[PDB]
Design a protein around this nucleic acid. Structure first.
Ligand SMILES: [K+]
Ligand SMILES: [K+]
Ligand SMILES: [K+]
Ligand SMILES: [K+]
Ligand SMILES: [K+]
Ligand SMILES: [Mg+2]
Ligand SMILES: [Mg+2]
Ligand SMILES: [Mg+2]
Ligand SMILES: [Mg+2]
Ligand SMILES: [Mg+2]
Ligand SMILES: [Mg+2]
Ligand SMILES: [Mg+2]
Ligand SMILES: [Mg+2]
Ligand SMILES: [Mg+2]
Ligand SMILES: [Mg+2]
Ligand SMILES: [Mg+2]
Ligand SMILES: [Mg+2]
Ligand SMILES: [Mg+2]
Ligand SMILES: [Mg+2]
Ligand SMILES: [Mg+2]
Ligand SMILES: [Mg+2]
Ligand SMILES: [Mg+2]
Ligand SMILES: [Mg+2]
Ligand SMILES: [Mg+2]
Ligand SMILES: [Mg+2]
Ligand SMILES: [Mg+2]
Ligand SMILES: [Mg+2]
Ligand SMILES: [Mg+2]
Ligand SMILES: [Mg+2]
Ligand SMILES: [Mg+2]
Ligand SMILES: [Mg+2]
Ligand SMILES: [Mg+2]
Ligand SMILES: [Mg+2]
Ligand SMILES: [Mg+2]
Ligand SMILES: [Mg+2]
Ligand SMILES: [Mg+2]
Ligand SMILES: [Mg+2]
Ligand SMILES: [Mg+2]
Ligand SMILES: [Mg+2]
Ligand SMILES: [Mg+2]
Ligand SMILES: [Mg+2]
Ligand SMILES: [Mg+2]
Ligand SMILES: [Mg+2]
Ligand SMILES: [Mg+2]
Ligand SMILES: [Mg+2]
Ligand SMILES: [Mg+2]
Ligand SMILES: [Mg+2]
Ligand SMILES: [Mg+2]
Ligand SMILES: [Mg+2]
Ligand SMILES: [Mg+2]
Ligand SMILES: [Mg+2]
Ligand SMILES: [Mg+2]
Lengths: 14, 122, 87, 41, 149, 206, 26, 179, 46, 97
RNA sequence: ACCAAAGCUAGCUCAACAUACUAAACAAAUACAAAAAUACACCAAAAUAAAAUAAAACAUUCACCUAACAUUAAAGUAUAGGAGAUAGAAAUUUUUAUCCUGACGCUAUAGAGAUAGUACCGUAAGGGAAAGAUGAAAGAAUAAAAUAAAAGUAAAAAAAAGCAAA
RNA sequence: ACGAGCUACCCAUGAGCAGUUUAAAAGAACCAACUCAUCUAUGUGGCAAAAUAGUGAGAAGACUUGUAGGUAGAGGUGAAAA
RNA sequence: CUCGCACACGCUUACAUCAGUAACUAAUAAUAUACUGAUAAUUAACAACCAAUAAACCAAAACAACACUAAAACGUUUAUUAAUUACAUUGUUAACCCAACACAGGAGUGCACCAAGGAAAGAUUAAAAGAAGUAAAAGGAACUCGGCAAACACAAACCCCGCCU
């Protein structure tokens, strides 16, 4: 299948 | 996205959305779309004559204060209507049926300025 | 600034017109007739506490209207900013 | 009654005192020191 | 009046009268160039053109001619210490033009005093002299000068 | 104007709305809560302007006048007795005007001084037959009057001159009220001759 | 703040050792 | 008469300006209703001038001379409003006996709360109003669970507050064993 | 062909879909308001 | 593993306060009182735990029986989940079986 | 020698007692696109909870799982169950009042998520944090006291050969 | 429970297609705006969670496009690619 | 070297004046449309808001003369009513919006292609490898899965599968 793991974002407060 | 925690006013929406900022309407729309402004609905400010009036926005420091006694509905009655009722009762002229002579009014709609509906703004 | 007149800027087609296109052989004018609208009546000015404004409306209408007519006549004859006006 | 280890400073000092003369990161880091100290004995 | 309930109007109602107005007006210096007849006021949001015209003609007896008003938007960008927007209040600015040719110029409300300016200069001169006296002597080399010998 | 304060706050002999207080306490900080023994408003017998005696500190047995009281932390400030020295005028190339500053004292280190014997004495509030709350000493048994102190405004009503916008005392105390049964709306309308004929229609409220 | 007193006092034994090493007594 | 917005020219450059005390509540009860009407505008003209000076102070980046004058005037305005209102409600109680000058009744909104619904002025009755008939004053059965939950949330908040007061009393006694 | 910009702002659509009026017109919508009031949300709806 | 560098204020505990001196005074009320009150009638605490003992499962079940109708909504739901998990763990999991 | 280290309050948890249970604030505006004074209306509604699981599979069944009025016993008994898993009463019994309520509960990676459902990420339902430390006085900042102890660096780059040590 | 502000389709209401070739506004022809994305090379934590450069197909129609409304998961929608 | 002015939709003071930038923001410096503090501002004629009922009327927009097939948005007049009363309320800044970014991407209409708007190179040396562009002796597909790519070429014919857009 169309395997793809979307990236995550670091929280802005850091 | 958009800010959901701000004030929704007329400046944010499209041209169609035009919300007043709190003013009181003073008319309506006529036949041709020209705004017909009713003279009565305009608040006519009433001012007295202060030329011959001697009073100032400040009071002298040496003027003594007084015991803070809020006006009471009972104290007002004992000051205005009680002397009239007391004299009439002693003279035998008191009429429990009609109290209009002492300032009591049965229905408020007759007078120009109601009290319970609070007709006058200020 | 002219914005205190008040005057408001706008953008649309720039047109130079005389009442007819250039092909019309009648390229000059004789007189103009103007009728003041309802908002500029004498009675309206008195209510708004405007006495000297009665003559201002007449003067403002004539100066702006006649200049546009006379200016358009000159530019239909070819006269413009760099050619000035001969007659 | 939450019980926490407070003398952990002396827990690692009993190990590092035998690893003061090593070369590299084995003389500072505890995890690398224990494997070196155990092999030393 | 603001924060009050006006009476609903139908046909034949009596004239609406307000005796103690709740409105307050600030006279401000224009930030840009204005003509000779224009006076700039700051008015509360609940005030209309007709209210301001009656406000000046009756309370202050100022023969105004035309009144124009606009709504100003305050800054809502700066963040608090806890990263929360703090919004300045929005104020309504109204311009009026006098009728009988009366001319108004905004006066200078803070004229300096020649004596006060002289006194400030003397105080500054005294402080400068005191600093010079307190300045250490370079030839002493940092040795304290309080002791005699 | 009243300035709101955080639920936990520290007082340091500076008013909350001062620039010195903001410099000491930025709005984004909060510190440890000091233990303050609760004293009810009816148990605080120390005011400003009465002579008191200092028990503990570098100076003991001396007497002085109370100038400032911190009710929040139960502090009494004597006038230049428990003093430490600081500098006021500071700039790049000059320093000076060495001004002594008085440190705060707690209530337990300060005891009120009776006027007659000039010695410390415990004070208890007593209700006399005149209906006035007057402090009463324990040892001597003599009452102590309240320490009348000038207000923070610094203006004495005894010596005052009326300005252009100051109302005279006679006009301030002049009474012109006639208590009739007409509102302010009715009286002013009939006073100026304002005449209205028509009446409002029926309005439905819901 | 861990509850206890043995840990607090046993370190005072170490602080004295460091002071002697840094500034030996005459 | 446009100079009324500014103080007299002799006082423009003064760094400190003295003023008298504000009107107290008791002093205004001795004045007549006609007298209070005239005094309101005397205060009104004073307050406009102070606001103009205060704004001009920010423009010139200079402190406002004796800013406490504005605080005194606004206090006088509030006292004048209070005493006249003290005459309106007292007169209303004698004539009608209603506590509040705006009609209203307690209603239960869709959210289950109890809300004091003020009335509004309309030229048509309640049943002939399109907008009014769309508002709902009653709680649906599903609101019962959510109304119950709000009680639990408020109960825990008060329960935490009460236990906090007890802890402080014990803590202060240990550090102040004067008993 | 370049996703990521699926949100095209519009005040007419936002106030018609997530507005306060729509939340009070359906029985399920009112429960959404009740949940947010109980949770203590600063903004119940757009 | 950093430890505090200052000696804490030593706790001056008095062994002879009112609580410790009078601790466990009437533990023998039944023995020396004509057996009029069992010592279990002196326990102060929860309603469902006065003179009772059990493991974690029997305690949660007992709490639901007595004061179940007086608990809050959120507390009632959390108790039900705890009962179900303990019921499954005690019976369907373990080593000795 | 830098980076760092240390502190004990904020408040919380579990009960008990308990009034009897949607707080505080409501001047004006709030279900037109909420917080916009003002026009001929429509208004409203209910239908058993299901399944993840257990029976080492899974179809009948599977405690608690919305509505019990409790405790000591009868009793895990009678019964109900692909009679398997497991489910499970009653008749009949026991229960003396008020005070004695506080803590072998935590102390900033703990305790509520909370300084807070706020920042911030989502169109929306929803998800949801980190963050505090001087002293009696900082109206003692040429200000003061304290550990100078984590990894990482500096003071002080390296000299044949080797699980780095013995 | 919440989602058709991207996308599939539809209902409203609007707005675009210049020149050139032909009795043609003919799902004709050449070629822009405009819309799709054939081939190759760069790019592969990149400018970009699908792009840039060159080259290509349609370009008066079964065409592109703005605003706004409708269909919701046992379903919606589909000139079937599950 | 050339995507420029304006409106709608959106964003919400990020715009303007003055001062400061050791540090925060710009992926650097100068510095200030973008960071900090104070003060100030968008003024209506344009735009939003801006009557109801009954009756007569089969006859398209495409320069519309007159016609085609797919049969087409676009109203006047008569009658009965409509508060009649200067000045109502509201949108007017910007170097901007949606894409985690001050992103070589996405973005509707009118008018121009400029009179307007902008800067490919921070300073050097001129190695390999890699990317993009120009030119070439003799030969012209001998390359290679294929003439892919490139070219001073820009043509002709056959077959298979689908009719065609
Ligand atoms: K088991
Ligand atoms: K939709
Ligand atoms: K890009
Ligand atoms: K913006
Ligand atoms: K081949
Ligand atoms: Mg958001
Ligand atoms: Mg708008
Ligand atoms: Mg706009
Ligand atoms: Mg008009
Ligand atoms: Mg305007
Ligand atoms: Mg997204
Ligand atoms: Mg779109
Ligand atoms: Mg199974
Ligand atoms: Mg298993
Ligand atoms: Mg089940
Ligand atoms: Mg059977
Ligand atoms: Mg925490
Ligand atoms: Mg911890
Ligand atoms: Mg270290
Ligand atoms: Mg070797
Ligand atoms: Mg759509
Ligand atoms: Mg064409
Ligand atoms: Mg074609
Ligand atoms: Mg496609
Ligand atoms: Mg391309
Ligand atoms: Mg290319
Ligand atoms: Mg090429
Ligand atoms: Mg083509
Ligand atoms: Mg073709
Ligand atoms: Mg839906
Ligand atoms: Mg399907
Ligand atoms: Mg399709
Ligand atoms: Mg297929
Ligand atoms: Mg398939
Ligand atoms: Mg943004
Ligand atoms: Mg730059
Ligand atoms: Mg500058
Ligand atoms: Mg700025
Ligand atoms: Mg980038
Ligand atoms: Mg460059
Ligand atoms: Mg370079
Ligand atoms: Mg090369
Ligand atoms: Mg090459
Ligand atoms: Mg070539
Ligand atoms: Mg060649
Ligand atoms: Mg070959
Ligand atoms: Mg070959
Ligand atoms: Mg091939
Ligand atoms: Mg090719
Ligand atoms: Mg073949
Ligand atoms: Mg085909
Ligand atoms: Mg064929």
């Amino acid at each position: 299948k169309k395997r793809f793991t979307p990236p995550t974002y670091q929280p802005k407060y850091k | 996205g958009a800010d959901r925690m701000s004030k929704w006013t007329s400046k944010r929406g499209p041209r169609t959305f035009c919300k007043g900022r709190g003013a009181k309407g003073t008319g309506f729309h006529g036949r041709d779309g020209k705004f017909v402004q009713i003279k009565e609905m305009i608040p006519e400010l009433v001012v007295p004559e202060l030329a011959g009036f001697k009073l100032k926005p400040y009071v002298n420091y040496r003027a003594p204060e007084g015991t803070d006694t809020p006006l009471t509905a009972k104290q007002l009655f004992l000051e205005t209507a009680a002397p009239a009722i007391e004299k009439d009762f002693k003279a035998g002229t008191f009429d429990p049926e009609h109290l209009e002579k002492y300032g009591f009014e049965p229905t408020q709609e007759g007078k120009l300025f109601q009290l319970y509906p609070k007709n006058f703004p200020r | 600034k002219p914005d205190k007149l008040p005057l408001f800027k706008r953008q649309y087609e720039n047109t130079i017109f005389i009442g007819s296109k250039t092909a019309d052989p009648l390229c000059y004018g004789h007189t103009q007739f103007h009728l003041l609208p309802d908002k500029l009546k004498r009675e309206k000015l008195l209510k708004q506490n405007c006495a000297d404004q009665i003559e201002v409306v007449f003067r403002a209408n004539a100066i702006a209207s006649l200049f546009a007519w006379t200016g358009a006549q000159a530019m239909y004859q070819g006269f413009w900013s760099e050619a000035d006006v001969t007659r | 009654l939450r019980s926490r280890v407070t003398d952990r400073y002396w827990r690692v000092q009993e190990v590092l005192k035998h690893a003061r003369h090593f070369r590299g990161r084995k003389n500072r880091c505890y995890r690398l020191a224990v494997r070196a100290v155990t092999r030393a004995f | 009046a603001r924060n009050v309930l006006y009476p609903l109007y139908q046909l034949g109602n009596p004239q609406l009268r307000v005796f103690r107005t709740n409105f307050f007006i600030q006279l401000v210096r224009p930030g840009t160039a204005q003509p000779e007849d224009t006076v700039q006021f700051r008015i509360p949001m609940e005030m209309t053109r007709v209210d301001l015209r009656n406000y000046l003609e009756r309370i202050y007896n100022v023969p105004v001619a035309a009144v124009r008003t606009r709504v100003q938007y305050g800054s809502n960008r700066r963040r608090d210490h806890r990263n929360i927007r703090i919004k300045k209040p929005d104020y309504k600015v109204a311009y009026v033009q006098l009728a009988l040719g009366q001319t108004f110029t905004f006066p200078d409300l803070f004229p300096e005093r020649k004596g006060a300016s002289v006194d400030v200069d003397v105080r500054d001169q005294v402080l400068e002299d005191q600093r010079q006296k307190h300045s250490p002597d370079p030839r002493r080399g940092g040795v304290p000068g309080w002791f005699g010998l | 104007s009243k300035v709101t304060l955080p639920p936990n706050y520290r007082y340091g002999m500076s008013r909350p709305g001062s620039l010195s207080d903001k410099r000491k306490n930025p709005p984004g900080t909060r510190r440890r809560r000091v233990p303050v023994e609760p004293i009810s408003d009816e148990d605080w017998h120390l005011f400003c302007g009465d002579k008191v005696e200092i028990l503990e500190g570098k100076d003991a047995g001396k007497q002085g006048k109370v100038v400032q009281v911190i009710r929040q932390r139960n502090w009494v400030v004597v006038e230049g007795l428990n003093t430490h020295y600081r500098y006021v005028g500071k700039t790049v190339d000059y320093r000076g005007t060495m001004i002594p500053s008085e440190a705060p004292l707690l209530h337990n280190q300060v005891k009120l001084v009776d006027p007659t014997d000039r010695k410390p004495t415990d004070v208890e509030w007593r209700f006399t037959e005149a209906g006035e709350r007057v402090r009463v000493s324990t040892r001597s048994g003599r009452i102590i009057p309240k320490p009348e102190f000038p207000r923070a405004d610094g203006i004495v009503p005894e010596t005052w001159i009326d300005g252009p916008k100051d109302t005279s005392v006679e006009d301030a105390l002049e009474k012109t009220y006639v208590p009739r049964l007409k509102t302010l709306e009715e009286e002013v309308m009939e006073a100026m001759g304002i005449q209205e004929t028509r009446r409002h229609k029926k309005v439905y409220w819901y | 703040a861990k509850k206890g007193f043995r840990a607090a006092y046993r370190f005072q034994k170490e602080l004295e050792r460091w002071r002697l090493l840094r500034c030996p007594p005459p | 008469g446009l100079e009324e917005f500014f103080d007299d020219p002799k006082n423009w450059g003064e760094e400190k300006v003295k003023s008298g005390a504000s009107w107290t509540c008791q002093q205004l009860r001795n004045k007549s209703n006609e007298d209070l009407h005239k005094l309101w505008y005397v205060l009104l003209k004073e307050r406009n001038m102070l606001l103009t000076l205060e704004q001009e102070a920010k423009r010139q980046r200079l402190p406002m001379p004796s800013p406490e004058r504005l605080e005194k005037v606004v206090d006088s305005m509030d006292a004048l409003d209070k005493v006249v209102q003290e005459r309106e409600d007292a007169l209303r109680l004698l004539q009608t006996g209603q506590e509040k000058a705006r009609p209203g009744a307690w209603r239960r909104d869709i959210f289950g709360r109890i809300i004091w619904h003020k009335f509004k002025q309309w030229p048509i009755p309640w049943y002939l109003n399109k907008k009014y008939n769309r508002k709902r004053f009653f709680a649906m059965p599903y609101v019962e669970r959510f109304v119950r939950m709000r009680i639990e949330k408020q109960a825990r908040i008060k329960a935490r507050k009460r236990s906090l007061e007890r802890k402080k009393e014990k803590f202060l006694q240990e550090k102040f064993p004067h008993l | 062909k370049a996703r990521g910009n699926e949100y095209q702002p519009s005040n007419i659509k936002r106030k018609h879909k997530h507005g306060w009026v729509r939340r009070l017109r359906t029985p399920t919508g009112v429960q959404v308001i009740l949940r947010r009031m109980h949770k203590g949300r600063k903004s119940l709806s757009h | 593993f950093h430890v505090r560098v200052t000696l804490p204020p030593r706790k001056v505990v008095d062994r002879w306060n009112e609580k410790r001196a009078m601790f466990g005074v009437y533990d023998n009320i039944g023995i020396l009182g004509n057996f009029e009150k069992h010592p279990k009638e002196l326990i102060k605490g929860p309603i469902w735990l006065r003179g009772w003992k059990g493991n974690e499962l029997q305690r949660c079940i007992r709490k639901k029986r007595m004061v179940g109708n007086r608990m809050f909504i959120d507390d009632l739901h959390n108790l039900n989940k705890r009962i179900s998990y303990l019921y499954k763990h005690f019976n369907r999991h373990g080593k000795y079986r």
